[PDB]
Amino acid sequence: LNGTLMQYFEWYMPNDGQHWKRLQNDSAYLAEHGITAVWIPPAYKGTSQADVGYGAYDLYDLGEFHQKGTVRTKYGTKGELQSAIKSLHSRDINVYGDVVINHKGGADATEDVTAVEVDPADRNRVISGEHLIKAWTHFHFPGRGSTYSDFKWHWYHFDGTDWDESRKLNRIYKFQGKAYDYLMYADIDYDHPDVAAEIKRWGTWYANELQLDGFRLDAVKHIKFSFLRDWVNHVREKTGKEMFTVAEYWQNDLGALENYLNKTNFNHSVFDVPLHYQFHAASTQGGGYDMRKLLNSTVVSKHPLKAVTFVDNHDTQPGQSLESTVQTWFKPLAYAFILTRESGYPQVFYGDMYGTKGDSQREIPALKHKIEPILKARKQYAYGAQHDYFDHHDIVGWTREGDSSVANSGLAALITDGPGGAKRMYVGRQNAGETWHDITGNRSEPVVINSEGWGEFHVNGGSVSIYVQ
């Protein structure tokens, strides 16, 4: 009954075109362990076959046309993708597609365009007069043609770019006269009527072509909010489906996140970036972190229904752009936090489950065996009223009284970044007389609940204990 999301990709996975098949083959397992939704990587053609998917060359080429020297994307062909989705739906698992719409990369040709240079500090402070540059702005899709869409991109559909091809220069350009490869990407202009109309149309095309159930919105911090709000309303309306949507607004600031939510009318969720940073901070301070701090400054604490909680993702993993990996020892504690507490729509990271494949000497190992018990705790026991016990600097915990709707439901969780200990927690008089055991197997001793519903729970240092049944 509890929903659980899974980011089904890692940055360093092999470019062998078998990913869609792996996903398909992984459906039973996912269902076994309570995964109710899967967020797949960008399925459209990038700047090269090896593109992780954020280059975003052609949104209408889901690994179907020979473009950028390949038919398939890094993950597979459109057909394999469609088969994987079919098997996922047969198992009652929803699929959320990634949406990369703040820029387009890998233009087919440059265009002579008039531009002005702006201040790197204040990107709306002109520090140059108008002048001609050659910008990678012409997209015509030679391999696709007009199939699915005859819309062609030109410089006027964009706000600017960071590369002048004529002078081979890197500066911040803003196009004038309108009605390290990433430096050549062009920033999409949502003030242009044709652009806003086209992205909304592709949006519903995308949802229908793959039978998607929702979306993951990429890099929303720089996209016009009103547009994002309307794009979401639009796809839901044209489609007639719920279309759960979560946006990646990367800002470790509850303030900025709430504003984003208010400006977008609360029509979609946001990743709990602040929570991740606390997880990282705690895993980094060797027991010096005040564990009672986890309950504040996060999105779940304020907008539980609008938060997608996560431990790490493809941006924070070792070697990436926003690297701030939660240390392995702390990882299972963070997972217990997001998977067994009532608030938030938790997300499990593929890289944490099966390990990351970068070449740092600090890659994430496959934690599947440590996480599986917590997924089971969420799937079968995390129900009913919750009681919080964040009364200590090191050891904190919470209980779930369970729900009659779900048999033997109920749990007592305990996590500590410092030394081990015990804590008496109210578990529900309804559970009185029961003998509970640590599902993570970290503690061997049983705990029998008293007649008043209380229990003395224990936990090892720098560890996690989740007592059930």
**Whole-number Å distance between alpha carbons of 456 and 25:** 43
Question: Helix (H, G, I), strand (E, B), or coil: what is residue 9?
Answer: coil
Query: Residue 191 annotated as binding?
Result: yes
CA-based nearest residue to 341, from 412, 404, 446: 412
Alpha helices (H) along 218-367: 225-239, 254-263, 273-284, 299-302, 331-340, 350-354
CB 235 within 8 A of CB 243: yes
Residues 6+ apart with CB under 8 A from 124: 118
From the list 275, 228, 232, the residue with the least C-alpha distance to 251 is: 275
Q: Which of 26, 58, 248, 401 is catalytic?
A: 248
Are 427 and 457 in contact by the 8 Å Cβ rule? The answer is no
Asked if the domains 1-101+193-383 and 384-469 are classified in one and the same CATH topology, the answer is no
What is the distance between the alpha carbons of residues 250 and 268, in angstroms, rounded to a whole number? Answer: 15
Contacts of range 320-329, beta carbons closer than 8 Å, 24 or more positions apart: 320/11, 322/250, 324/276, 324/277, 324/280, 325/280, 325/362, 325/364, 326/276, 326/279, 326/280, 326/283, 327/283, 327/284, 328/364, 328/365, 328/367, 329/283, 329/462
Strands 94-99 and 214-217: parallel
User: How far apart, in whole angstroms, are the C-alpha atoms of residue 4 and residue 341?
Assistant: 12
Which backbone phi and psi does 274 adopt, to 5 degrees? -60, -40
Ligand-binding site membership of 26 (annotated): no
- Distance (Å, rounded) from C-alpha 177 to C-alpha 135? 14
- Residues 312 and 349 sit within 8 Å (Cβ to Cβ): yes
Q: Is 214 within 8 Å of 186 (Cβ atoms)?
A: no
CB atoms under 10 Å from CB of 217, counted, come to 25
DSSP string, 193-254: HHHHHHHHHHHHHHHHHHT--EEEE--GGGS-HHHHHHHHHHHHHHH-S--EEEE----S-H
- List CB contacts of 328: < 8 A, sequence separation 6 or more: 364, 365, 367
CATH number of 1-101+193-383: 3.20.20.80
Long-range contacts of 357-363 (CB under 8 A, 24+ apart): 357/10, 357/12, 357/13, 357/14, 358/11, 358/12, 358/317, 358/318, 358/319, 360/318, 360/319, 362/318, 362/325, 363/318
Q: Confirm or deny that 119 is annotated as ligand binding.
A: no
CA pair distance 45, 171, nearest whole angstrom:
27
What's the fold here for domain 102-192? Answer: Elongation Factor Tu (Ef-tu); domain 3 (2.40.30)
**CA–CA separation, 439 and 84 (whole Å):** 32
φ, ψ dihedrals at 127, nearest 5°: -125, 15
Terminal alpha carbon distance of the chain: 18
Distance between CA atoms of 5 and 314, rounded to whole angstroms?
Answer: 15
269 bridge partner residues? 246
The reply, when asked if residue 394 is annotated as ligand binding, is yes
Tokens of residue 212, six digits: 């998607």
| Token code pair at residue 61 | 């080429």
Give whole-number Cα distances, 256 to 250, 259, 274, 299, 304, in Å. 10, 5, 11, 11, 16
Task: For residue 389, give the nearest of 430, 341, 345 by alpha carbon.
Answer: 341
Instruction: For tokens 């998917």, name the residue.
Output: 53
Residue 219 has, within 13 A of its CA and on its CB side, a CA count of 16
User: Is there a binding annotation on residue 140?
Assistant: no
How do the domains of the chain map onto residue ranges?
1-101+193-383, 102-192, 384-469
- Strand bridging mode 37-39 / 186-188: unpaired
- Crossing angle for the helix pair 368-380 and 331-340, nearest 10 degrees? 20
- The distance of Cα 236 from the centroid of its chain, to the nearest Å, equals 20
Known binder of ligand: residue 233?
A: no
Which structure tokens are listed for 287? 């027991």
**Would the CA dihedral through 386, 391, 394, 395 be positive or negative?**
negative
Q: Shortest CA distance to 195 belongs to which of 81, 101, 73?
A: 101
At 409, give phi and psi (nearest 5°): -65, 160
Concerning whether 162 is annotated as a catalytic residue, the answer is no
Q: Nearest 5°: CA angle at 458, between 456 and 461?
A: 155
How many other C-beta atoms are found inside a 10 Å radius of the C-beta of residue 140?
A: 15
Instruction: For 328-462, list the strands marked E by DSSP.
Output: 347-349, 386-389, 395-400, 411-416, 421-426, 435-438, 447-448, 454-459
The H-or-E segment that residue 465 falls in is: strand 464-468
What distances in angstroms separate CA 84 from CA 77, 91, 183, 314, one per listed residue?
11, 11, 34, 21
**Under a CB-based contact definition with an 8 Å cutoff, are residues 210 and 97 in contact?**
yes
Tokens coding 317: 């993993």
Residue 222 annotated as part of some ligand binding site = yes
**Torsion of Cα atoms, 236 then 239 then 240 then 245, to 10°:** -30
Name the burial class of residue 168, with classes exposed (0-12), middle (13-18) and buried (19+) by CB atoms within 10 angstroms of its CB. Answer: exposed
Q: In this structure, are strands 37-39 and 5-7 parallel, antiparallel, or unpaired?
A: parallel
Which of 88, 170, 106 lies closest to 142, judged by CA?
A: 106
Contacts with 144 (C-beta within 8 Å, 6 or more apart), sequence order: 58, 60, 61, 64, 65, 67
The span from the CA of 39 to the CA of 216, in Å, is 7
Of 12, 11, 8, 13, which Cα lies nearest the Cα of 24?
A: 8
**164 marked as part of a ligand binding site:** no
Helices and strands (H, E) in the chain, number of each type: 11, 22
- Residue 210: closest CA among 222, 202, 218: 202
Angle between helix 78-90 and 193-210 (nearest 10): 60
Largest Cα–Cα distance in the chain? 81
CATH annotation of 384-469: 2.60.40.1180
Task: Report H helices in 285-422.
Answer: 299-302, 331-340, 350-354, 368-380
189 is in an annotated binding site: yes
| 159 annotated binding-site participant | yes
5, 66 contact by CB (below 8 A): no
Contact between residue 420 and residue 451 where contact means Cβ atoms under 8 Å apart: no
Strands 103-104 and 186-188: antiparallel
Among the options 218, 272, 401, 438, which is catalytic?
Answer: 218
Nearest to 418 by CA among 365, 464, 467: 464
Experimental technique, in short, is X-ray
User: How many other β-carbons are positioned within 10 Å of the β-carbon of residue 274?
Assistant: 22
- Which phi and psi angles does 90 have, rounded to 5°? -60, -30
Cβ within 8 Å of residue 408, ≥6 positions away:
380, 381, 402, 468, 469
Among this protein's residues, is 218 annotated catalytic?
yes
Known binding residue 112? Answer is: no
With vertex at residue 258, the alpha carbon angle to CA 253 and CA 260, rounded to the nearest 5 degrees, is 100
Contact yes or no for 452/427 (Cβ under 8 A) = no
- 179: annotated binding-site residue? yes
Give the list of residues 6+ apart from residue 259 with CB closer than 8 angstroms, or none: none
